[PDB]
Ligand binder design. Structure first.
Ligand SMILES: NS(=O)(=O)c1cc2c(cc1Cl)N[C@H]([C@H]1C[C@H]3C=C[C@@H]1C3)NS2(=O)=O
Ligand SMILES: NS(=O)(=O)c1cc2c(cc1Cl)N[C@H]([C@H]1C[C@H]3C=C[C@@H]1C3)NS2(=O)=O
Ligand SMILES: NS(=O)(=O)c1cc2c(cc1Cl)N[C@H]([C@H]1C[C@H]3C=C[C@@H]1C3)NS2(=O)=O
Ligand SMILES: NS(=O)(=O)c1cc2c(cc1Cl)N[C@H]([C@H]1C[C@H]3C=C[C@@H]1C3)NS2(=O)=O
Ligand SMILES: N[C@@H](CCC(=O)O)C(=O)O
Ligand SMILES: N[C@@H](CCC(=O)O)C(=O)O
Ligand SMILES: N[C@@H](CCC(=O)O)C(=O)O
Ligand SMILES: N[C@@H](CCC(=O)O)C(=O)O
Lengths: 260, 270, 270, 260
């Protein structure tokens, strides 16, 4: 009985190698999440199959319908057994799926094309000359929707009432938008992906400010599943012997195809 | 019914008030941990009384007769219901108790007494004889110590990394023992050692001591490992889900961030 | 029963929202004044309807055919119940309506176009032809005027001081139509006058226009006097005491200061 | 029937004349408040007698007793008819006495001896080596006690718990304590008296930071008294014709025994 694993096409977590057209099975995928899934299977001792989520959405619940899309929907509705992917641990998602202990710390950061006048987030909210956006159906957008800090509510009020839409469909599309905006558009994304982008050639984007908050990535399992304890123990073990640190160093700093 | 909550006197997590001789109940203690417990009670209503573990240890797997001591030992054997205190999440601990989601990020850091400023146009510069863990392990002129019955000692004991293994090998044979009973003893040793002692401790406490007078000690390098603090609860308890949900609610509400800002950086004496 | 609340369209006190076409009720208007009305309704429970007076005037009294116009006229003759708007407290108005305690300080000032940077070691300095009110009265190469049917004209008309009386005499002697119907018209006259006109207005609006693009005007000198903005109710009304108490409570609670900061200094530029 | 006017001994509002031993009656008093009372009587048309408050307190309500002392006590208990004195208009005082329109704006300031490390109030609250105190039985003390702002709350916690008594009995005692503390003490007092002190020789004190809030001095009358409207319109008249400004300039800047 193989285990269906739901992932997303996001770098450096999952890459579609370079010759996927002439490869079969999981051998056509590479990345941090593929290595993490391999280690999880090695510790637990189960066969796994890598399946991409049908819709390129991390997961959210749409109001007035009460339905889930993406990996979270693929988990609550029994379409997959485990989600080794950069899924943010949030209060809403925990009520419907089980989150393991975080395996990668993260924070909300602001990145712009290459002293930067943006500086911190409050100045970005005050300065309306330069626009800022957020990935569609992500934890950042839901974080800003339910935020209560006055500055964060100002940012949310600006984003929900803007023309055209400041939101972006995919992270790569947001990177392209910020690169092609000549410093007129800003992107709010996770610290890990932003760092990976800023350490990659041509290196036309940089991180500004600090981290708005602190979150984490966890291995997701369906509610009431028997895999929660083994995957939690495996994540704890990997953190104890630093396999996660080695994987992050390999996939974030070993290549270093940038000037730094 | 009022449950038993256990804490340990570590500043700024749990500190005794100046006017505490006559006060009774939960009003005796003040700190970050008591505020976290108050917010936990506000989210899910329950009655709690602040207690301190008898031997004042975080909890370690004692060898030989296989006995758990300190906070974890109290939690396991039914004398405790929940521990709201800076207890790091550990695989060994996770196999023995249940841990909530990390409410505080942490890492192993290195402490050293701040050297005197170098005189050499006329600008003044600081020279750090210690920079990283590899250089600290390579040298022998400066001894280094850890906390007795602490998760840092467990991490060093079974670390496959060559530098960490060499460090632990030095620790086990070093005489007199560099291990200290309380973090206060370690900070005192660092202060009185004239710079000949490096006491490894969690990044949060190191930053707290740095921000506070007499601010004669400094934190060197980056975090060797990345870990977190979790609210402990005995296995097979119905209270784990409410505390996990309350921690998630507090983290998403920004209460934890403002509490950390007000307890670690608002009281900056240097 | 819903009472009538009359206001005046002055930024940032009362400005229509961009998407006001497809909205009805009080949701169309936004600014400092609507927030003050919301706090007033929160303190004392009542329903209010936001209305704009037909002639769009603050209030003045004719001498030959005595009649009160604008907001004060609306309040006196029973057409309105309360005016939560920047109405200056005046002795003449106090004899025809009831003013609560002031909720914002103010002062008569002078507006002038911002001069160009002076190139002539290499520094840039701001030099203005006007330094205070006395020089403006003494000089005759820059014309000045106030707002039509307002409190500033009333103050200048019956001022015994030599400088202000002389200014009023020139206001009757220059003989253009130096009095402007709206504050926006006077600001536009100052901006497009290339440096030939000075506008007298309240310090609050002066600062608001100063901190907003294209910011081609400066605040010169200091306030010629001190006045305030009060919530006005008709004489003999039972609502004067509740609104007075609500304003006092808001002032003690710091809500007024936070609204002033968020509507005057948190939206600035250049 | 002469009208009893309750005043307090506080400069420059009311000064006890140096020749008062040979001066009998209302002639023995001079100051801003004496001139204001003279103008009020000139407008309204009543005979006035200035009587100092028995106990040098502006006014407050005792906790667990519910009694009023000082000017407010002298007003609500029928001891005096009008209070022409620097009485701060506050929320709780208005419920028991009638306040007129303010005749002088004011704010909460900071007093220290002559780099200015303290600067603003938040930095004053951050630092502990230097202590700050206010005057008991006054608007500032009640405002600090009843303030709900976190920074003001921590200031109140500091002053309410300090040994010895950080509070002061009189404004002159406060400025003397500031002068003799060699910069180790801070006084939070009304901005008007702060300016008067800082412009008076030997000029060893100066104002730092900005005003924490905005209040006003008003003429006080007993609840239900008939003097409300006459004194209110008199204050409005005086403020409109600038006599109030002239008196302020005379009693604060005309002498100028300092260099500025
Ligand atoms: N350095 S990092 O961001 O790749 C990173 C971040 C984290 C790691 C491990 C690594 Cl390598 N483990 C912790 C978990 C492990 C065990 C101890 C704390 C939680 C449970 N979560 S974390 O603090 O989010
Ligand atoms: N800034 S901090 O170290 O006090 C801190 C650290 C952390 C916080 C919140 C704060 Cl304020 N919440 C996260 C939690 C939120 C959700 C994602 C990871 C856990 C579950 N853990 S954390 O990354 O260990
Ligand atoms: N800073 S400001 O001009 O917006 C401002 C000005 C004033 C405020 C409050 C604010 Cl926020 N309250 C006072 C009121 C409070 C009590 C004392 C005077 C009146 C009654 N009036 S004020 O001195 O005219
Ligand atoms: N220049 S000053 O501080 O002596 C001063 C301050 C003030 C004065 C008059 C003077 Cl001279 N009058 C106003 C009053 C007049 C009318 C408008 C606001 C109140 C009612 N209060 S005030 O803004 O507190
Ligand atoms: N990976 C995040 C989305 C990234 C973002 O917030 O922009 C999530 O699973 O919610
Ligand atoms: N926080 C650690 C103790 C500190 C240390 O070991 O350095 C624990 O809970 O075990
Ligand atoms: N605020 C003034 C009008 C503005 C002005 O005259 O400059 C009033 O209420 O009369
Ligand atoms: N004059 C003030 C007291 C001065 C102070 O606040 O220190 C009052 O009447 O309340």
């Amino acid at each position: 009985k193989t285990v269906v694993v739901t992932t997303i096409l996001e770098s450096p977590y999952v890459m579609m190698k370079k010759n996927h057209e002439m490869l079969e099975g999981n051998e056509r995928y590479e990345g941090y999440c593929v290595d993490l899934a391999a280690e999880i299977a090695k510790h637990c001792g189960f066969k796994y199959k890598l399946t991409i989520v049908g819709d390129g959405k991390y997961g959210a619940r749409d109001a007035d319908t009460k339905i889930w899309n993406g990996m979270v929907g693929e988990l609550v509705y029994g379409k997959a057994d485990i989600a080794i992917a950069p899924l943010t641990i949030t209060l809403v998602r925990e009520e419907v799926i089980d989150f393991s202990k975080p395996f990668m710390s993260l924070g909300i950061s602001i990145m712009i094309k290459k002293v930067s006048p943006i500086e911190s987030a409050e100045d970005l909210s005050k300065q309306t000359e330069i626009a800022y956006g957020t990935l569609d159906s992500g934890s950042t957008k839901e974080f800003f929707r339910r935020s209560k800090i006055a500055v964060f509510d100002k940012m949310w009020t600006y984003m929900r009432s803007a023309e055209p839409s400041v939101f972006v469909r995919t992270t790569a599309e947001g990177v392209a938008r910020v690169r092609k905006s000549k410093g007129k558009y800003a992107y709010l994304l996770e610290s890990t992906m932003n760092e990976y982008i800023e350490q990659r050639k041509p290196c036309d984007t940089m991180k500004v400010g600090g981290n708005l908050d602190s979150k984490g990535y966890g291995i997701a399992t369906p509610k009431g599943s028997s895999l929660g304890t083994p995957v939690n123990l495996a994540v704890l073990k990997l953190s104890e012997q630093g396999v996660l640190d080695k994987l992050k160093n390999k996939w974030w700093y070993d290549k270093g195809e940038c000037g730094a």
